[PDB]
Structure 1
């Protein structure tokens, strides 16, 4: 698979069905799925799979229900542990397109309350549970029970008003979803639903919430250094 948008296949990538998986840490993998757009080619999107405490936690669906079912089948073959929950990082197809497949499999799903409120308007199925956030961006703990090492942070409006981010405690990894672009990116992607006034502050807030992380994982590029955060913020500075 050679995407028009998104990272290409490299050493360390395992093809499974129509998906690609890459191990990032002993208990963390990146899932990649592709949306084939007529006349344009494939768009890759990345999410995470985390093994913690005898279970698996998923960050983001694939673009489709079938692709998300294939993620669950890869988990069964390679990890063979129950998938306890999924957190999805905003109400757009690349992050929430496969909700029905998670629900059919009995997996509990979580999203920002605002993602769930926007979901139908965005063509998405809402998650079963809503996360809420303090004014400082951190998830209200009672809304995110039994999240293991996942640290869920709402950085403010940016790529969308509802975008959230996830760090993995005890690892070098933080996940910016579609908010963060890589350090060589030429644009901020689709700004159609974006908050151009607050984007730069939201990117910087993500960086400050996860100060230690050296591996920055994002929706449409390979994992990068913290230069992805700095570059995203500087690009966003130009929007205001």
Structure 2
């Protein structure tokens, strides 16, 4: 089940994959959750997304030390919002190499985020350029197009049932997408469907703001987005 560790929650999703969850109180609504991933790749660990804060992200590293006890080789962060990049300092303090879409790194200062140390770029078909994502092990990074934000990226976990949609995808029980002025409401639906088509064998869809769901999360999200066009 869910393992509590400090103020975070960790859930094993597969033999080599865990979901990290961190919480932030907002005005009028407490304990807004955000999820990321932790992946064991042989003798190293890879992280997808920080927690909301530096202190919480340090607790992710502490949990990894206690439960996995392998070095964290790198982290990928999936766009320039606080839930995904708010804890970059904890990673850099620990010497962990960080990667984000070049556009996320360009947006980070405007958003009050610390940029990742390396930039990912993408082919016209959305797949990460290998020269920018060397030695990513099972992390298969895909840029699906603009949607939740212009910079949002997604990550398949090779060999598992799992694909991570980040904040682009919401579960099949969602009532809305959030989506604000930095959403692209013209392309959101196609971007959500492109994520599904990029990871056609994924049966467990992991998301930032919902618990894991089946592929219906992708379809339901796309159908909500269709109505915004």
Secondary structure at the aligned position of 1:176 is classed as strand
Residue 191 of structure 1: how far off its partner (Å): 2.5
Ranges in structure 1 where 5+ consecutive residues have no aligned partner: 1-11
1:38 deviates by: 3.9
Deviation of 1:203 (Å): 0.2
Give the structure 2 partner of residue 114 of structure 1.
103
Runs of 4+ with deviation above 6 angstroms:
none
Contact 1:53 1:148 in 2 (8 A): no
Q: Deviations over 1:2-28 (max 9, x none)?
A: xxxxxxxxxx10000010000000000
Contact kept? 1:23, 1:29, Cα under 8 Å: yes
Contact 1:115–1:126 (CA under 8 A) maintained in structure 2: yes
Q: Secondary structure at the match of 2:22?
A: strand
Once the two structures are TM-superposed, the CA of residue 81 in structure 1 deviates from its matched residue by 0.3
Q: How many residues in Structure 1 have an aligned counterpart in Structure 2?
A: 229
Distance, in Å, in 2 between the alignment partners of 1:222 and 1:40 is 18
CA RMSD of aligned residues (A): 0.6
Structure 1: how far apart are the matches of 2:150 and 2:58? 28
- Between the aligned partners of 2:15 and 2:43, the Cα distance in structure 1 is 14
Q: Structure 1: how far apart are the matches of 2:140 and 2:28?
A: 39
Q: Distance in 2 between matches of 1:97 and 1:136?
A: 29
- Quote the Cα distance in structure 1 between the aligned partners of 2:178 and 2:60: 25
> How far, CA to CA, are the matches of 1:145 and 1:119 in structure 2?
23
State the alpha-carbon separation in 2 of the partners of residues 117 and 52 from structure 1.
Answer: 29
In 2, distance between residues paired with 1:157 and 1:38?
Answer: 28
Q: Residues 153-203 of structure 1, C-alpha deviation per residue, up to 9 Å, x if partnerless?
A: 000000000000000110000000000000110000232310000000000
TM-score normalised by L of structure 1: 0.94
Alignment check: 8 A CA contact 1:163 1:179 kept: yes
Write the distance in 2 (CA, Å) between the matches of 1:57 and 1:105: 14
Question: What secondary structure does 2:166 align onto?
Answer: coil
Cα distance in 2 between the residues matched to 1:192 and 1:68: 28
- 1:6 is matched with none
